[PDB]
Amino acid sequence: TIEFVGVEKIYPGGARSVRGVSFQIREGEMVGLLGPSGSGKTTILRLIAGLERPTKGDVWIGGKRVTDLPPQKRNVGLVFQNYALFQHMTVYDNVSFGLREKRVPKDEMDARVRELLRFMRLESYANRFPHELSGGQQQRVALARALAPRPQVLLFDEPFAAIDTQIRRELRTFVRQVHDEMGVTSVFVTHDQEEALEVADRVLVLHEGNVEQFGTPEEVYEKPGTLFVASFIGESNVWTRAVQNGRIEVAGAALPVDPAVSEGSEVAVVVRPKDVELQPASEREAHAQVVRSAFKGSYSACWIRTKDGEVWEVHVPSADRHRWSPGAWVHMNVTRWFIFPR
Amino acid sequence: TIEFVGVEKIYPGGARSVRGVSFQIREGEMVGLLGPSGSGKTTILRLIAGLERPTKGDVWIGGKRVTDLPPQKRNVGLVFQNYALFQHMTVYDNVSFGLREKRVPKDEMDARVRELLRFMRLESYANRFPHELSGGQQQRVALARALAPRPQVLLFDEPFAAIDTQIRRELRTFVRQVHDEMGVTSVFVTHDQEEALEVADRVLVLHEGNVEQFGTPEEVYEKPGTLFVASFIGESNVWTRAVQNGRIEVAGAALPVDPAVSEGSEVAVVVRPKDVELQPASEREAHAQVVRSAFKGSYSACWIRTKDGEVWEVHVPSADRHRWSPGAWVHMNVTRWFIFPR
Numbered sequence: 001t002i003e004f005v006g007v008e009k010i011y012p013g014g015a016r017s018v019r020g021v022s023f024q025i026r027e028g029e030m031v032g033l034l035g036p037s038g039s040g041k042t043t044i045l046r047l048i049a050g051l052e053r054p055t056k057g058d059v060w061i062g063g064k065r066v067t068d069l070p071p072q073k074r075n076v077g078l079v080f081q082n083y084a085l086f087q088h089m090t091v092y093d094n095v096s097f098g099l100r101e102k103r104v105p106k107d108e109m110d111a112r113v114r115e116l117l118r119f120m121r122l123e124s125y126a127n128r129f130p131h132e133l134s135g136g137q138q139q140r141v142a143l144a145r146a147l148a149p150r151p152q153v154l155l156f157d158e159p160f161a162a163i164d165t166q167i168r169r170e171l172r173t174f175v176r177q178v179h180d181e182m183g184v185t186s187v188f189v190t191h192d193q194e195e196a197l198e199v200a201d202r203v204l205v206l207h208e209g210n211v212e213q214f215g216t217p218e219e220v221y222e223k224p225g226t227l228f229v230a231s232f233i234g235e236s237n238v239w240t241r242a243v244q245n246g247r248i249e250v251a252g253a254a255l256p257v258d259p260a261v262s263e264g265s266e267v268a269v270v271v272r273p274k275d276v277e278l279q280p281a282s283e284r285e286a287h288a289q290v291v292r293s294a295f296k297g298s299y300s301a302c303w304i305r306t307k308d309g310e311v312w313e314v315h316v317p318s319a320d321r322h323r324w325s326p327g328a329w330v331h332m333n334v335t336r337w338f339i340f341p342r
Numbered sequence: 343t344i345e346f347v348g349v350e351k352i353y354p355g356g357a358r359s360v361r362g363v364s365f366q367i368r369e370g371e372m373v374g375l376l377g378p379s380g381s382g383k384t385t386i387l388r389l390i391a392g393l394e395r396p397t398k399g400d401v402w403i404g405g406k407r408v409t410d411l412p413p414q415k416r417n418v419g420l421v422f423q424n425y426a427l428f429q430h431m432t433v434y435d436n437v438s439f440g441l442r443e444k445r446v447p448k449d450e451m452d453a454r455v456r457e458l459l460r461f462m463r464l465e466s467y468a469n470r471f472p473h474e475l476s477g478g479q480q481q482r483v484a485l486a487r488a489l490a491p492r493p494q495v496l497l498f499d500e501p502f503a504a505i506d507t508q509i510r511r512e513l514r515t516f517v518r519q520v521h522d523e524m525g526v527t528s529v530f531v532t533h534d535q536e537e538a539l540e541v542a543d544r545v546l547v548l549h550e551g552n553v554e555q556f557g558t559p560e561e562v563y564e565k566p567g568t569l570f571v572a573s574f575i576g577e578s579n580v581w582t583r584a585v586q587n588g589r590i591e592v593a594g595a596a597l598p599v600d601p602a603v604s605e606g607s608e609v610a611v612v613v614r615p616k617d618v619e620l621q622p623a624s625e626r627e628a629h630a631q632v633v634r635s636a637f638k639g640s641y642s643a644c645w646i647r648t649k650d651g652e653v654w655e656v657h658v659p660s661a662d663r664h665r666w667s668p669g670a671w672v673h674m675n676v677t678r679w680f681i682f683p684r
């Protein structure tokens with residue numbers, strides 16, 4: 001339902017620039033705009049809202065060129081951190097606000113509102129004012145207000161920041177359940193790759209104002225298109241190695257390098273913490289020495305320092321929470337990896 | 343090096359109250375004060391700093407009663423979000439600030455500063471001003487300034503908020519490496535249980551101004567002292583069940599209940615997402631129906647809805663990323679659990 005055609009919006013300061021972007025978001029899809037602060041992800045969200053206008057290129061929604069139409073003129077609803085519930089209005093009135101302008105007759109406006117309130121578990125709070133509710137409940141009300149008018153597109157601008165970690169997690173699960181229910185098209189901004197993998201159908205990875213990759217969680221995690229995607233999605237150990245005899249040396253192992261990479265050129269080897277296995281050994285021949293471990297529930301995190309001074313992060317099964325002690329010497333076993341040209 | 347003795351500081355509004363707390367933090371230990379917003383965790387950090395004073399009880403540091411001593415009078419350094427590097431001073435001068443007041447002669451102040459700068463990889467930035475550095479580098483400078491005077495205690499008040507997820511993670515790994523190096527005693531505030539498990543030696547779980555538990559990451563995760571600890575550390579599915587015939591029914595399984603829990607009383611069953619196994623089945627006898635799955639790298643997250651309408655979150659191995667499709671019917675297998683009295 002959304003499309004950017006060679007959209008460009010450059011800021012002389014760098015951050016926030018969008019550098020000639022094009023993509024197509026499917027109807028009913030939930031897309032996460034994932035990137036570093038100032039990578040262009042927020043500008044893109046704002047370009048879809050109409051809060052910003054492209055210097056070149058166009059924005060389409062529902063096959064409808066809306067590049068020059070204001071926010072009010074687009075079929076999109078906003079759930080922004082920039083927002084604020086009407087503090088002196090009850091939950092009921094905050095939510096009816098949108099229907100209030102579509103000239104919907106009283107009876108139908110009412111049924112629409114009651115509909116949204118029960119769906120979102122806010123019936124017991126209809127006659128309450130925003131200050132009487134928890135932040136969590138206030139976000140449910142904001143999503144109800146945005147949805148009332150039946151928007152075509154739903155835009156989220158990190159509305160859950162300044163929230164406690166646990167409530168933030170319950171919220172994203174709620175927003176997802178609501179999305180699947182309302183069948184709308186949703187786009188959200190985030191600098192947290194875990195959040196993107198968790199709720200998005202597809203992820204748009206942004207970097208320096210360009211789209212690095214646009215794919216499913218599995219796609220961006222298992223088949224990263226660039227070193228940036230490889231290093232920004234999931235966790236990773238990233239190091240430089242020089243190619244010699246068609247291979248690089250990683251932990252006493254020769255990793256073959258694609259023949260298209262020239263002898264003597266440098267590459268980044270990317271190895272995920274879970275993809276490295278540790279086995280006891282003597283300092284004599286050991287690859288690394290354990291700095292320390294941390295039990296994280298589903299797995300134990302183990303940091304080790306190689307002979308060359310590289311500190312690697314390795315994830316071992318919970319069933320090994322007590323296997324590696326500080327100072328201990330160990331052998332490494334890289335099992336999966338990525339290799340990208342520097 | 344730190345001890346609270348029946349410390350009490352109550353706020354008429356609830357949030358921030360500390361309700362009769364006592365604990366002992368070991369020398370060279372890194373402790374995480376983990377709790378919901380307003381649970382008393384920040385007030386406690388401030389009580390150690392001297393920024394706040396207890397209404398009752400006392401605070402000890404290094405076996406030294408300091409309850410009535412100001413921040414300046416305590417052997418503690420601050421790395422707060424409330425802070426701000428001196429923008430018009432170079433990195434070198436920002437860091438020498440502390441030594442500057444211990445009347446340390448020029449030569450020795452200089453060697454101390456150069457010492458800290460090289461340790462923290464800020465030598466190439468000595469003659470730069472704060473605005474010339476990334477936020478990440480600015481935090482390294484703040485930690486250097488706090489450490490210059492050789493504080494006994496190091497206090498962190500969520501200094502990494504308003505930071506990108508990836509840099510926040512690199513920062514905590516750095517703060518930990520520094521801590522292990524300087525051998526100081528450190529306390530940090532956090533509402534993120536994952537962060538606490540990752541870097542703390544022991545975690546102080548706060549709730550409504552009381553200490554729920556004080557133990558190692560493994561302790562609080564595997565042996566939660568209360569339902570709150572069980573539901574606040576790690577991930578969990580939490581549901582109520584009534585006891586009948588000395589057991590509760592969870593997914594077609596009878597979980598025995600400790601004989602000390604009376605017939606007819608209600609309990610909370612806590613089951614971690616990773617501790618539930620799914621196997622195909624007919625709707626006829628199936629326990630749940632898959633709402634959806636999300637690939638998260640090391641594991642696939644699967645949400646299912648039971649016949650009774652409970653939506654459970656289950657974590658299945660990456661090796662099963664494509665095994666469960668929406669609508670699909672399934673059988674559940676709870677393998678580990680906790681049971682606490684409601």
Ligand SMILES: [Cl-]
Pocket residue numbers: 015016017037038039040041042043044
């Ligand atoms: Cl941006």
Ligand SMILES: [Cl-]
Pocket residue numbers: 357358359379380381382383384385386
């Ligand atoms: Cl607090």
